[PDB]
Amino acid sequence: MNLMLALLTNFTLATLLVIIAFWLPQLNVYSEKTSPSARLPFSMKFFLVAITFLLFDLEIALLLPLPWASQTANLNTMLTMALFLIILLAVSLAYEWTQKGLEWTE
Amino acid sequence: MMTGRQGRATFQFLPDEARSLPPPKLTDPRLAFVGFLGYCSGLIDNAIRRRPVLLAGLHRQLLYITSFVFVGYYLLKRQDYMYAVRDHDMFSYIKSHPEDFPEKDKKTYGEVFEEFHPVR
Amino acid sequence: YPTKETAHWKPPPWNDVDPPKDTLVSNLTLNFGPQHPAAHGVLRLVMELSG
Amino acid sequence: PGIVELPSLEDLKVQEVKVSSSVLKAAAHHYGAQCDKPNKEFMLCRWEEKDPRRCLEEGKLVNQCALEFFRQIKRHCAEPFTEYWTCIDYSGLQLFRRCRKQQAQFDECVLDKLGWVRPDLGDLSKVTKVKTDRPLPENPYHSRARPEPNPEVEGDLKPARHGSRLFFWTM
Amino acid sequence: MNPIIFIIILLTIMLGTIIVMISSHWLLVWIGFEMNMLAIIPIMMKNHNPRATEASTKYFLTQSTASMLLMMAVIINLMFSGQWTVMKLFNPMASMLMTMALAMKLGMAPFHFWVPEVTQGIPLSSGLILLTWQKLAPMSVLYQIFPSINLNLILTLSVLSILIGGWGGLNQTQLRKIMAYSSIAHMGWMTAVLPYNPTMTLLNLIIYIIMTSTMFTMFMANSTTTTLSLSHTWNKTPIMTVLILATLLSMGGLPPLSGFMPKWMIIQEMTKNNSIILPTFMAITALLNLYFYMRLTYSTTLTMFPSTNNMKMKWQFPLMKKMTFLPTMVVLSTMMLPLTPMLSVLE
Amino acid sequence: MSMVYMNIMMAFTVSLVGLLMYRSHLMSSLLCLEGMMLSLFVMAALTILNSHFTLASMMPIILLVFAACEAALGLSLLVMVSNTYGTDYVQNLNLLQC
Amino acid sequence: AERVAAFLKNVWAKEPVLVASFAIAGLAVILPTLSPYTKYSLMINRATPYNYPVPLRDDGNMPDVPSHPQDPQGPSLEWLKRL
Amino acid sequence: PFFDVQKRLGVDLDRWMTIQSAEQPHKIPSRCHAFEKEWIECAHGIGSIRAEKECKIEFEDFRECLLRQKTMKRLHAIRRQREKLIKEGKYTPPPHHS
Amino acid sequence: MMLYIVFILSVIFVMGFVGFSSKPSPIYGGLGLIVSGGVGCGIVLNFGGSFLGLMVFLIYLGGMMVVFGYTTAMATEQYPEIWLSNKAVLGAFVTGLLMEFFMVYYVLKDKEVEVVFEFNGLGDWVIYDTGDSGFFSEEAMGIAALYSYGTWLVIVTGWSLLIGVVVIMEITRGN
Amino acid sequence: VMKDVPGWKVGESVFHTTRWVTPMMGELYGLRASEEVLSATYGFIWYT
Numbered sequence A: 001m002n003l004m005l006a007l008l009t010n011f012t013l014a015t016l017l018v019i020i021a022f023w024l025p026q027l028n029v030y031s032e033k034t035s036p037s038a039r040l041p042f043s044m045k046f047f048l049v050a051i052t053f054l055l056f057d058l059e060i061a062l063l064l065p066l067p068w069a070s071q072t073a074n075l076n077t078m079l080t081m082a083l084f085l086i087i088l089l090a091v092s093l094a095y096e097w098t099q100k101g102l103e104w105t106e
Numbered sequence B: 001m002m003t004g005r006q007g008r009a010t011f012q013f014l015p016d017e018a019r020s021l022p023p024p025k026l027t028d029p030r031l032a033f034v035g036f037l038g039y040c041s042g043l044i045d046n047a048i049r050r051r052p053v054l055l056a057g058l059h060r061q062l063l064y065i066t067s068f069v070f071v072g073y074y075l076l077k078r079q080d081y082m083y084a085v086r087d088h089d090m091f092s093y094i095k096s097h098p099e100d101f102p103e104k105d106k107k108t109y110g111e112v113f114e115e116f117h118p119v120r
Numbered sequence C: 001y002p003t004k005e006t007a008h009w010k011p012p013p014w015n016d017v018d019p020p021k022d023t024l025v026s027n028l029t030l031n032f033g034p035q036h037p038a039a040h041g042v043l044r045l046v047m048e049l050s051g
Numbered sequence D: 001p002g003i004v005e006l007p008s009l010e011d012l013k014v015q016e017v018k019v020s021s022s023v024l025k026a027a028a029h030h031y032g033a034q035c036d037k038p039n040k041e042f043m044l045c046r047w048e049e050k051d052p053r054r055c056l057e058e059g060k061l062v063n064q065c066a067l068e069f070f071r072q073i074k075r076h077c078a079e080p081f082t083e084y085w086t087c088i089d090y091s092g093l094q095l096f097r098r099c100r101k102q103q104a105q106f107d108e109c110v111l112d113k114l115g116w117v118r119p120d121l122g123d124l125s126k127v128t129k130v131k132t133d134r135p136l137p138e139n140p141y142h143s144r145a146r147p148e149p150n151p152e153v154e155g156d157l158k159p160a161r162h163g164s165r166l167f168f169w170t171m
Numbered sequence E: 001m002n003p004i005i006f007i008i009i010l011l012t013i014m015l016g017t018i019i020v021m022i023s024s025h026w027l028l029v030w031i032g033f034e035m036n037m038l039a040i041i042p043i044m045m046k047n048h049n050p051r052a053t054e055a056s057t058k059y060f061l062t063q064s065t066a067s068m069l070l071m072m073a074v075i076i077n078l079m080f081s082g083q084w085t086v087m088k089l090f091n092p093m094a095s096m097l098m099t100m101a102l103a104m105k106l107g108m109a110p111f112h113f114w115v116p117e118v119t120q121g122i123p124l125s126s127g128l129i130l131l132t133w134q135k136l137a138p139m140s141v142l143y144q145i146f147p148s149i150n151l152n153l154i155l156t157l158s159v160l161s162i163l164i165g166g167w168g169g170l171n172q173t174q175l176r177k178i179m180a181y182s183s184i185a186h187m188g189w190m191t192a193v194l195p196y197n198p199t200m201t202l203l204n205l206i207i208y209i210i211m212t213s214t215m216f217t218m219f220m221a222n223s224t225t226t227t228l229s230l231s232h233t234w235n236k237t238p239i240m241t242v243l244i245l246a247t248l249l250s251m252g253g254l255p256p257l258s259g260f261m262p263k264w265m266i267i268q269e270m271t272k273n274n275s276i277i278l279p280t281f282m283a284i285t286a287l288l289n290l291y292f293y294m295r296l297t298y299s300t301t302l303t304m305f306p307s308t309n310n311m312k313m314k315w316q317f318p319l320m321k322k323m324t325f326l327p328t329m330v331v332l333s334t335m336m337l338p339l340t341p342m343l344s345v346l347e
Numbered sequence F: 001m002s003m004v005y006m007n008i009m010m011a012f013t014v015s016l017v018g019l020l021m022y023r024s025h026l027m028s029s030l031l032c033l034e035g036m037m038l039s040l041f042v043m044a045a046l047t048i049l050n051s052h053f054t055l056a057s058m059m060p061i062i063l064l065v066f067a068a069c070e071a072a073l074g075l076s077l078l079v080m081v082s083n084t085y086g087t088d089y090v091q092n093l094n095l096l097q098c
Numbered sequence G: 001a002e003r004v005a006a007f008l009k010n011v012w013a014k015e016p017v018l019v020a021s022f023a024i025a026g027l028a029v030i031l032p033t034l035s036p037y038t039k040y041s042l043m044i045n046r047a048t049p050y051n052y053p054v055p056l057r058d059d060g061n062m063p064d065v066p067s068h069p070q071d072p073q074g075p076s077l078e079w080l081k082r083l
Numbered sequence H: 001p002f003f004d005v006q007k008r009l010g011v012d013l014d015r016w017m018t019i020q021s022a023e024q025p026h027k028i029p030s031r032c033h034a035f036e037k038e039w040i041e042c043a044h045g046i047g048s049i050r051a052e053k054e055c056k057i058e059f060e061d062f063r064e065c066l067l068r069q070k071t072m073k074r075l076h077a078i079r080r081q082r083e084k085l086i087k088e089g090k091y092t093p094p095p096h097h098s
Numbered sequence I: 001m002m003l004y005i006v007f008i009l010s011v012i013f014v015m016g017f018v019g020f021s022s023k024p025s026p027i028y029g030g031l032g033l034i035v036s037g038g039v040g041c042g043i044v045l046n047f048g049g050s051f052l053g054l055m056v057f058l059i060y061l062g063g064m065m066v067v068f069g070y071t072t073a074m075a076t077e078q079y080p081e082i083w084l085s086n087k088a089v090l091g092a093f094v095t096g097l098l099m100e101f102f103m104v105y106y107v108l109k110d111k112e113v114e115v116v117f118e119f120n121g122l123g124d125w126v127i128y129d130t131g132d133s134g135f136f137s138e139e140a141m142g143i144a145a146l147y148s149y150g151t152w153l154v155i156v157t158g159w160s161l162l163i164g165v166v167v168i169m170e171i172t173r174g175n
Numbered sequence J: 001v002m003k004d005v006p007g008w009k010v011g012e013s014v015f016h017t018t019r020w021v022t023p024m025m026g027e028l029y030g031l032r033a034s035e036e037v038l039s040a041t042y043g044f045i046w047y048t
């Protein structure tokens, strides 16, 4: 219950601050002003950094249980598979690195 | 139907019980036909590559025949094993269920009545 | 078997390649000024960028 | 299906151990050493029977042993013990390592006045053996009789009669 | 592609299929399909053109939807049986979902529309993978869950596939579209016999793969993708026209060729189960496929279409494409009927 | 079954209908695909957690990982489509009609 | 050799971050197989009692199973106290 | 499996997670462990055609443990009956139950 | 009413799904999915899946959905049509909430509804387990076992992620 | 409560087996106040 109350309170206050931040200036009654999809074009590089983040982020999901995994009796198996995951994460980086997937020059 | 045979050693090309069966004879007519198919493949290989069909690359033609005959021999051993197993299963079941396969008391034609249909 | 609903159909390209004629406009044009006008102020830079 | 058999409320009535978890935590090591026998009989019953209804008598003896254990502390060592579990109770995690000074005072008291020796690290996690007269349950899962297996196929493998017998093939 | 990367990607396509085929766990089956789909997309995109991108997108949408339905069936099966073993499903809803998911993956009618378009949009070598190797994993699953499959559903999918495949191929001049409809029609035979004898599903699959592999390889040897470009073969490589003729007749199921064998053995199994109407309907409807195979033989081997002057320049150079296993495949595609009893090795 | 399953199964059904009924944006259809996976993740987790199937607790993670990887592939194809045509509209993907 | 030493010199001059990264990773993969205290990690994990130790029914001939937790028989944690 | 490589090589690739009555970390049992054990042992070796008939009692109990459909039906009947009598004032909850 | 927290959350879960399944502009479609994901995590938490719930937030919302919104901005939408300002989008949205409302109405009133499966409306709490006093989280123990029991799972999952990096670089190179 | 319901057997099991089955939350707290049920069901999950 407490966590729900905390989240409700935090986002309730944030909401009130936002609306009063938008209403309080209307007290001034400032004068009227009367004076002012598709590609972006998007670079492929900015798409590829986002995708690389995602795939690296998925591999991090598999590594999060490591603190618990170290409590097992089969430590040799656990350590072998833990290093296997991190190494494949390094191999993903090495492949990206050596095919110029990490460059910003056009 | 025979996937879950009680004595199925799974994922084995030729289980050990197959060694009780007589091997295919090297003069088996089916093995001779397999060798002939190998020889035809050798001739086709020459034809598509525009070599003299009958004479070109006799070493290559020999390996076509050998490999077909070699693979054919083992496929026939498995073929004969699988039909032996089918018969073995069938006869065991018939013995275990005599009430389902009764020997008929079968009469002579002198006793059984068949209708006559004249052709006129 | 030609029909009225396939009259507009045409054979595909000989090499499977369709010309790229749709949208290829990747060069930004940026009217560039200084972040803070305290020092420069009077610089206008019409730059054409590619990424 | 049948009617689930349940014991009567009177059959379930026992004198409870109405002390808090900090009290139990403080006494746990000596309690584990002193009351091992009735406790282990109860746990052997629960794992063998797999039915709480079958171990209610052994469960009552667990309570009576516990009550006599705490009566011994209330009789000879109340003040050192009260000091010890009051320290344990302060901690949000009820940590042993915060109260080694009061633990020593309590351990010294029970050793002198009762002869109790605190079990060593690892002792209470041993698998032990217990004497019991309760017979070993025969069918604890109440399993039905298993279906009979299919008749075995036996004998020597012989070549198929007249071959594959597929349509016209003679082999 | 870097050739090493191309090899690794092909090996992953195979690994995904092998995982499906050795897995005893539904999650590992699903993973095998996911791995397979991921690895095949690059080989479809490898020539970089809008048509290859459209085909890759259409394939991705179809396969991803199928894989989500497969997972839904697995989870429903878990809820009603509490286990994950690859075997008969324990809920009729799960059975229907998985059957439909596998039909979508196979391109069976009425889930077929993607097969002609995806095949047309990718190179011949990619189409060969799509129409042969890609059938192995879904078939291996159907082979294991068939006892729980709804009989009416699977037979309905089979009949529609034979009808749609036969009719769809009649209107085609593109070789890749002809092979796509031929694949759909041949799919219906494999599933039609599955409830009765799954071994004959495997027999038809193996022979279909061999004949389809032979056809694609011969189309690749001369870089022909249309009927009219294939009609020039007689004036370049005459032997290829004879081999094409024999294989097309075999795919038509004509005795005494190899392609008759699966039709012959399927008819036998269905009649043993007192299914007379359905095999007769299937056999007759298969004449549609024979018709548009025969049309190809007319323009390729049995007549001589007009050539071009520049064809004379081609006479001076040899075929340098690898044509791997082609002599062996073409012999197996045509001359195996006398060895039909060897099908027992599949039992 | 319990009441919660009704809603999780409705959510899968809703997202499946949303997947099969395209509008224009290919992106809007990919979201429905991810919605399908989210409902599968929740239904799988509820079944596994409630039954105390301990070793199956890892299955929802594998589901999420493989589905996100497949979503990365889908997004990459969408970007390549948008490069060819300048929009992700599915009506431009009709070349293979012929 | 000396070609090997020169190569290690060029990377240590140009890519010290990667040299350190491969060195640290190499130790991570090698030292566990060489360490004598690795065996204790397995023993300690097995000495942690998450579950109740269900007692055995005493048939009458299990000499090495203690009847009481403080009896001498059974596995000891003496090695752990000193470690 | 289509190809039973695991059994031939005697390597356990994925069997360890197929059923909930297999070995679990720290011997945590699933809620329906006993029912699944009894159904598996009943049906073992005899094939699925026979098992669908001869282990129906075990499978029905296992399915009841999994989804509790009959337990919830019985609870709903009691609760429905109870609220009917409370509306009519012909029943009063005891001190416990409140 | 707090005793039906799971059911109430699952109603919001369906409403969010009807959100993006009616397929408004992709920008707001992502918003419906984000809310559904957050509610989805909430349902999983209330069944004892704390780690699983937080994975949704970390990986599904903080990972996958961030990338979706990133891609939508670059390749798809830059400004959206007003939500529910289109005939089909609004009609689909209204249709979904009517179906949800009626399912909720009958399940609560008759305490049971039947569509494909039989559903009971007593309350999701009734199926919960009544025995819990271990000194650990069973969910965490099962996930931790990935590295001991699940060697084969790690290999194929690890291989698929590596191949994903390779494949996506192949696809996007353009030559 | 079920005294007059026709055909009702009081305390009948829904399982064929006579083995003891751990009750689920509804069977234990089925007839009780919402506060105790709420604590028994979600108290641990909701504790900080």
Ligand SMILES: CCCCCCCCCCCCCCCCCC(=O)OC[C@H](COP(=O)(O)OCCN)OC(=O)CCCCCCCCCCCCCCCCC
Residues within 6 Å of the ligand: B026, B031, B032, B033, B035, B036, B039, B054, B055, B058, B059, B061, B062, B065, B069
């Ligand atoms: C030692 C070197 C290493 C290699 C050794 C391998 C040898 C075996 C491989 C197979 C080769 C067989 C021999 C082929 C001989 C070809 C010789 C040749 O090409 O000369 C042509 C010859 C005469 O023709 P000519 O008179 O010159 O001109 C006529 C114009 N029309 O015309 C002929 O007379 C050719 C006659 C036909 C060829 C023989 C046919 C053999 C059939 C094999 C059947 C296979 C059955 C397998 C069964 C095995 C079962 C166990």
Ligand SMILES: CCCCCCCCCCCCCCCCCC(=O)OC[C@H](COP(=O)(O)OCCN)OC(=O)CCCCCCCCCCCCCCCCC
Residues within 6 Å of the ligand: E237, E238, E239, E241, E242, E243, E245, E246, E249, E256, E257, E301, E302, E330, E331, E334, E335, E336, E337, E338
């Ligand atoms: C074993 C039991 C099972 C029996 C089943 C039947 C087995 C036969 C099927 C085997 C597979 C087909 C391969 C047959 C080999 C064909 C050989 C051949 O036809 O010669 C090719 C010929 C050569 O042309 P070229 O390149 O100019 O070389 C000139 C040679 N000096 O090329 C040409 O000249 C072009 C010829 C013009 C087109 C003629 C079309 C008719 C071809 C008839 C033969 C096809 C037979 C296939 C149908 C089965 C027949 C039963």
